[PDB]
Design a protein around this motif. Structure first.
Motif, PDB file in Angstrom:
ATOM      1  N   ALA A 182       0.740  -0.933  -0.211  1.00 13.44           N
ATOM      2  CA  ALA A 182      -0.074   0.261  -0.041  1.00 13.44           C
ATOM      3  C   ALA A 182       1.091   0.993   0.018  1.00 13.44           C
ATOM      4  O   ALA A 182       0.729   2.545  -0.516  1.00 13.44           O
ATOM      5  CB  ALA A 182      -0.726  -0.232   1.426  1.00 13.44           C
ATOM      6  N   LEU A 183       1.972   0.897   0.635  1.00 16.38           N
ATOM      7  CA  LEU A 183       2.410   2.489   1.438  1.00 16.38           C
ATOM      8  C   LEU A 183       3.096   2.502  -0.410  1.00 16.38           C
ATOM      9  O   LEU A 183       4.193   3.955  -0.856  1.00 16.38           O
ATOM     10  CB  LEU A 183       3.856   2.164   2.151  1.00 16.38           C
ATOM     11  N   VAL A 184       3.881   1.891  -0.906  1.00 17.14           N
ATOM     12  CA  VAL A 184       4.452   1.979  -2.291  1.00 17.14           C
ATOM     13  C   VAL A 184       2.849   1.808  -3.179  1.00 17.14           C
ATOM     14  O   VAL A 184       3.667   3.370  -3.828  1.00 17.14           O
ATOM     15  CB  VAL A 184       4.792   0.414  -3.225  1.00 17.14           C
ATOM     16  N   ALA A 185       1.883   2.046  -3.012  1.00 14.66           N
ATOM     17  CA  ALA A 185       0.561   2.503  -4.156  1.00 14.66           C
ATOM     18  C   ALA A 185       1.045   4.028  -4.155  1.00 14.66           C
ATOM     19  O   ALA A 185       0.451   4.611  -4.900  1.00 14.66           O
ATOM     20  CB  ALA A 185      -0.761   1.376  -3.419  1.00 14.66           C
ATOM     21  N   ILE A 186       0.947   4.044  -2.920  1.00 19.70           N
ATOM     22  CA  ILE A 186       0.849   5.835  -2.296  1.00 19.70           C
ATOM     23  C   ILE A 186       1.742   6.790  -3.066  1.00 19.70           C
ATOM     24  O   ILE A 186       1.222   8.128  -3.358  1.00 19.70           O
ATOM     25  CB  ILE A 186       0.255   6.473  -1.111  1.00 19.70           C
ATOM     26  N   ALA A 187       2.979   5.879  -3.052  1.00 19.75           N
ATOM     27  CA  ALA A 187       4.309   6.755  -3.151  1.00 19.75           C
ATOM     28  C   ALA A 187       4.302   7.544  -5.049  1.00 19.75           C
ATOM     29  O   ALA A 187       4.357   6.525  -5.707  1.00 19.75           O
ATOM     30  CB  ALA A 187       4.989   5.587  -2.584  1.00 19.75           C
ATOM     31  N   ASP A 188       3.591   8.843  -4.581  1.00 22.29           N
ATOM     32  CA  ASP A 188       4.216   9.719  -5.556  1.00 22.29           C
ATOM     33  C   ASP A 188       5.987   9.924  -5.862  1.00 22.29           C
ATOM     34  O   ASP A 188       6.740   9.441  -4.839  1.00 22.29           O
ATOM     35  CB  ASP A 188       3.124  10.718  -5.476  1.00 22.29           C
ATOM     36  N   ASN A 189       6.395  10.519  -6.617  1.00 24.29           N
ATOM     37  CA  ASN A 189       7.663  10.744  -6.675  1.00 24.29           C
ATOM     38  C   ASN A 189       7.955  12.298  -6.139  1.00 24.29           C
ATOM     39  O   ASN A 189       9.288  13.329  -6.930  1.00 24.29           O
ATOM     40  CB  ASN A 189       8.418  11.099  -7.860  1.00 24.29           C
ATOM     41  N   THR A 190       7.949  12.811  -4.823  1.00 26.52           N
ATOM     42  CA  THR A 190       7.472  13.843  -4.501  1.00 26.52           C
ATOM     43  C   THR A 190       8.921  13.842  -3.522  1.00 26.52           C
ATOM     44  O   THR A 190       8.395  13.126  -2.546  1.00 26.52           O
ATOM     45  CB  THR A 190       6.544  14.883  -3.990  1.00 26.52           C
ATOM     46  N   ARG A 191      10.324  14.496  -2.991  1.00 24.81           N
ATOM     47  CA  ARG A 191      10.554  13.908  -2.061  1.00 24.81           C
ATOM     48  C   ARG A 191       9.849  14.343  -0.324  1.00 24.81           C
ATOM     49  O   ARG A 191      10.119  13.201   0.521  1.00 24.81           O
ATOM     50  CB  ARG A 191      12.008  15.615  -1.403  1.00 24.81           C
ATOM     51  N   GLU A 192       8.819  14.940  -0.108  1.00 23.86           N
ATOM     52  CA  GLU A 192       8.363  14.817   1.198  1.00 23.86           C
ATOM     53  C   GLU A 192       7.342  13.751   1.325  1.00 23.86           C
ATOM     54  O   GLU A 192       6.949  13.237   2.436  1.00 23.86           O
ATOM     55  CB  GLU A 192       7.219  15.797   1.113  1.00 23.86           C
ATOM     56  N   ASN A 193       7.047  12.978   0.269  1.00 24.39           N
ATOM     57  CA  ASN A 193       5.944  12.101  -0.028  1.00 24.39           C
ATOM     58  C   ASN A 193       6.876  10.674   0.417  1.00 24.39           C
ATOM     59  O   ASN A 193       6.466   9.653   1.486  1.00 24.39           O
ATOM     60  CB  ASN A 193       4.796  12.096  -1.067  1.00 24.39           C
ATOM     61  N   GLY A 236       7.132   2.502 -11.294  1.00 25.83           N
ATOM     62  CA  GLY A 236       7.783   3.291 -11.283  1.00 25.83           C
ATOM     63  C   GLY A 236       8.850   4.669 -10.126  1.00 25.83           C
ATOM     64  O   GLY A 236       8.538   5.197 -10.362  1.00 25.83           O
ATOM     65  N   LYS A 237       8.656   3.755  -9.235  1.00 27.03           N
ATOM     66  CA  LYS A 237       7.808   4.427  -7.822  1.00 27.03           C
ATOM     67  C   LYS A 237      10.005   4.087  -7.740  1.00 27.03           C
ATOM     68  O   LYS A 237      10.223   3.191  -6.521  1.00 27.03           O
ATOM     69  CB  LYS A 237       7.525   3.745  -6.428  1.00 27.03           C
ATOM     70  N   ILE A 238      10.823   5.560  -7.972  1.00 22.46           N
ATOM     71  CA  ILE A 238      12.366   5.513  -7.611  1.00 22.46           C
ATOM     72  C   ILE A 238      12.567   5.675  -6.625  1.00 22.46           C
ATOM     73  O   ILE A 238      13.389   4.638  -6.117  1.00 22.46           O
ATOM     74  CB  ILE A 238      12.861   6.622  -9.044  1.00 22.46           C
ATOM     75  N   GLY A 239      12.084   7.006  -5.501  1.00 26.78           N
ATOM     76  CA  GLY A 239      12.605   6.470  -4.268  1.00 26.78           C
ATOM     77  C   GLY A 239      12.511   6.225  -3.141  1.00 26.78           C
ATOM     78  O   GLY A 239      13.240   5.687  -2.742  1.00 26.78           O
ATOM     79  N   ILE A 240      11.446   5.008  -3.100  1.00 25.89           N
ATOM     80  CA  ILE A 240      11.004   3.821  -2.287  1.00 25.89           C
ATOM     81  C   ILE A 240      11.847   3.295  -2.620  1.00 25.89           C
ATOM     82  O   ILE A 240      12.373   2.099  -1.894  1.00 25.89           O
ATOM     83  CB  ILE A 240       9.481   3.644  -2.035  1.00 25.89           C
TER      84      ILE A 240
END
Length: 257
Positions: A182-193, A236-240
């Protein structure tokens, strides 16, 4: 005598006037009715008064709610009342706890759990959506997964550490997604997220490794056959994605030469 019905009861709770509810207990006892009865449910949604209470707050506080549960307990209808599922155009199988978490009320969250709330009630989607105003937003269905995806650590701490009934971290939803998925599902690619997603992901593994040492969370797959790491790659969730790799390299430091 004092007589009640849906519109009256719904007006009393929507305004948030506890003084109006006096002599309701007596009404229910004599007429042999409960608050979960179809006549006190909004037929359109299935909502009882408890959600409606949680949807109408006077600066984060509706005072009808505490008595509503006291009354429910005195008619042998407490567990049912809290767990009464309702639906809107976005979700089916919602519960009072989902709203309690959604509106970010620690206190009402605490209260409902302590008095027998289902911590695994799954808020399932209906027909599907866009990004634009569409209060859909997939969060993993479960109350733990909801709280995780909205950055609410104290609720996560409570749901896992509370004395009455605790939220299983291993629990998977209809998609097969655990809280990590789920955390990946919501994960967008902005630093505060990526800040809180990463922080919450690590907190959960640390929490789970302790409680259930014979089972690894990130080892559990979804119905696609993917892990939290792989799903991050695919979607494509790069940060996570980097952080999970960057983590396990650090965990390989359990190997001294």
């Amino acid at each position: 005598m004092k007589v009640f019905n849906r519109p009256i009861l719904f007006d009393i709770v929507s305004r948030g006037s506890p003084d109006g509810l006096e002599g309701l207990l007596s009404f229910l006892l004599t007429h042999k009715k409960r608050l979960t009865d179809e006549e006190f449910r909004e037929p359109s949604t299935g909502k009882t008064c408890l959600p409606k209470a949680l949807l109408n707050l006077s600066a984060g506080r509706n005072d009808t709610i505490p008595i509503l549960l006291d009354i429910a307990e005195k008619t042998g209808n407490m567990r049912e009342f809290i767990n009464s599922p309702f639906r809107d155009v976005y979700y089916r199988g919602q519960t009072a706890l989902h709203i309690a978490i959604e509106r970010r009320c620690k206190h009402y969250v605490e209260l409902l759990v302590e008095k027998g709330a289902d911590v695994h009630a799954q808020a399932r989607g209906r027909f599907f959506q866009p990004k634009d105003e569409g209060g859909y937003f997939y969060f993993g269905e479960l109350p733990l997964s909801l709280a995780a995806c909205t950055n609410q650590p104290h609720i996560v701490h409570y749901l896992t550490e509370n004395g009455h009934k605790q939220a299983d971290l291993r629990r998977q939803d209809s998609r097969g997604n655990t809280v990590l998925h789920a955390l990946v599902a919501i994960a967008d690619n902005t630093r505060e997220n990526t800040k809180f997603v990463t922080k919450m992901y690590d907190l959960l593994l640390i929490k789970c490794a302790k409680l259930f040492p014979d089972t690894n969370l990130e080892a559990l797959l979804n119905n696609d056959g993917l892990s939290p790491l792989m799903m991050a790659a695919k979607t494509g969730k790069i940060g996570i994605f980097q952080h999970i790799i960057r983590r396990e390299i650090a965990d390989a430091a359990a190997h001294h030469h």
